[PDB]
């Protein structure tokens, strides 16, 4: 499922992400453009053996368990398979654990392509 931009913004507002830990809603939406290109099914194998999964590319070394990862700490008590749903709740709840740990610097696409920029642009035009 490829979310639309306002669609995703609005699924995010309904799940409590707006200004969560101070990060305005544009940050979360921008994070998903660059991590997953809005794709709930996105999976990338990483250079360290881990894999990221879903809309907010949640990492299988630290946060989700996938069975094939070295140093798996599974600090969201969740299978990576559960984060690949349309219906973004699983991914949002783990995103709240992560952001509460380094802030959104956990998301490399956010650090590199969203942080310090006009992030609300990503929700500008949505109701």
């Amino acid at each position: 499922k490829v979310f639309g931009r306002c669609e995703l913004a609005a699924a995010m507002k309904r799940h409590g992400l707006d200004n969560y830990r101070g990060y305005s809603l544009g940050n979360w939406v921008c994070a998903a453009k660059f991590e997953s290109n809005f794709n709930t099914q996105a999976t990338n194998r990483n250079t360290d053996g881990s894999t990221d999964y879903g809309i907010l590319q949640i990492n299988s070394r630290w946060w989700c368990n996938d069975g094939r990862t070295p140093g798996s700490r599974n600090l969201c008590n969740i299978p990576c398979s559960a984060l690949l749903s349309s219906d973004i709740t699983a991914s949002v709840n783990c995103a709240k654990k992560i952001v509460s740990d380094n802030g959104m610097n956990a998301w490399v696409a956010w650090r590199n392509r969203c942080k310090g920029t006009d992030v609300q642009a990503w929700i500008r035009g949505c109701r």
Epitope: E35, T47, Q57, N59, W62, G71, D101, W107, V108, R111
Partner: nanobody, 119 residues
Framework: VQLLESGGGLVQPGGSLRLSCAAS????????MGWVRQAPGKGLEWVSS????????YYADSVKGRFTISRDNSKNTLYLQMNSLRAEDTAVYYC??????????????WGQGTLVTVS
Amino acid sequence: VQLLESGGGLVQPGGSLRLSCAASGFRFDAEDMGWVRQAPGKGLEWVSSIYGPSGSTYYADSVKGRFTISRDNSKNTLYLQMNSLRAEDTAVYYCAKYTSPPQNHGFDYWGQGTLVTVS
């Protein structure tokens, strides 16, 4: 922060090579690091990781038992001992680490890579 790979070159099938990575600008003794490789024209594959003060090592299923990863913490150098090199191992091999764990994307910082050709 510098990661300078060395010791890649031509080797015949069945042979061996040891890759070295000179690390500076950070506390080597502890940092998680690893080797990643890019074959032509595949994506970037993980090869091996060594984590923490523990030194707990790990390896891809394509290289278990053949390659050995090691820190020489007296010269702040990371070693990959490659044995029984086989055509499919031709790649650029890079030394990688994380810029700010815990993070996604795996290793986001890497050296220049050294070329290994098994023919």
